[PDB]
Amino acid sequence: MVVIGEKFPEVEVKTTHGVIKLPDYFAEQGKWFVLFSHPADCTPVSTTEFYAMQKRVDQFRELGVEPIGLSVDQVFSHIKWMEWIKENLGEEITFPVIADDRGELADKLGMIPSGATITARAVFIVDDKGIIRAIVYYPAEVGRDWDEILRLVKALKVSDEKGVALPHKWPNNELIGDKAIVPPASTVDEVKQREEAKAKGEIESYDWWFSYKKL
């Protein structure tokens, strides 16, 4: 019961890093946060996701995006589980993990499938304004791909710094490559695009179909 572009509910949650409020603990220091949920149905796949997210927690943090886990568990079970991951899989877990009980956040963030209080492997990208910028709902049985979520958060970043729209499989589109397209003029072209085209920058056009930055 949330959509893209809606404010994250600014709620109080107990994590393995204190008790925080979400678009305060991250939005205040101008941080995005990738809030990824977990069912308690499948928790060997959750383990692989936690091993992978820590395996690539630098890439998220270099981007200025804070990973933050979530599940309907208690904190003590999570710290014990993450210590198991450190012991068996040789990997710390450095990001916080929310512990919502009775699934209040998942009810107010729409992560509860109907007929089962948890079946969704949900990911929310929330920007430094607190805007829910992208949602993913994998099934419990299929572990996600954090390379894809890395690509999505890189694309959300680039579209924010450079105001562009990011093609399919950017930056490995088969037609284009890594070139991000400037959103087409919703008014007369001259307002920005003719001023800023290859006459006055690297906002070069692509056969008059669009303007790309390659940036």
The conformation of residue 183, written as its DSSP 8-state character, comes to P
- Report yes or no: 169 and 152 within 8 Å, Cβ to Cβ: no
Give the shortest CB-202-to-ligand FL3 separation in angstroms.
Answer: 15
Q: Does 212 bind its own copies (CB under 8 A)?
A: yes
12: partner contacted, choices ligand FL3, its own copies, none (Cβ within 5-8 A by kind):
none
Q: How far is it, in rounded angstroms, from Cα 69 to Cα 164? A: 29
- Report yes or no: 181 and 210 within 8 Å, Cβ to Cβ: yes
| Closest by CA position to 203, among listed 187, 188, 181, 185 | 181
Specify the residue, 62 or 208, whose C-beta has the smaller distance to its own copies.
Answer: 208
Specify the residue, 73 or 127, whose C-beta has the smaller distance to ligand FL3.
Answer: 73
Q: How far is CA 63 from CA 6, 84, 214, in A?
A: 22, 28, 18
The SS3 assignment for 96 reads: coil
161: partner contacted, choices its own copies, ligand FL3, none (Cβ within 5-8 A by kind):
none
Q: Does 167 bind its own copies (CB under 8 A)?
A: yes
Among 25, 49, 65, 130, binds its own copies (CB under 8 A): 49
The contact set with ligand FL3 (CB under 6 A) reads 41-45, 73-74, 76-77, 80-81, 83-84, 141, 159, 163-165, 181, 183-184, 209-210
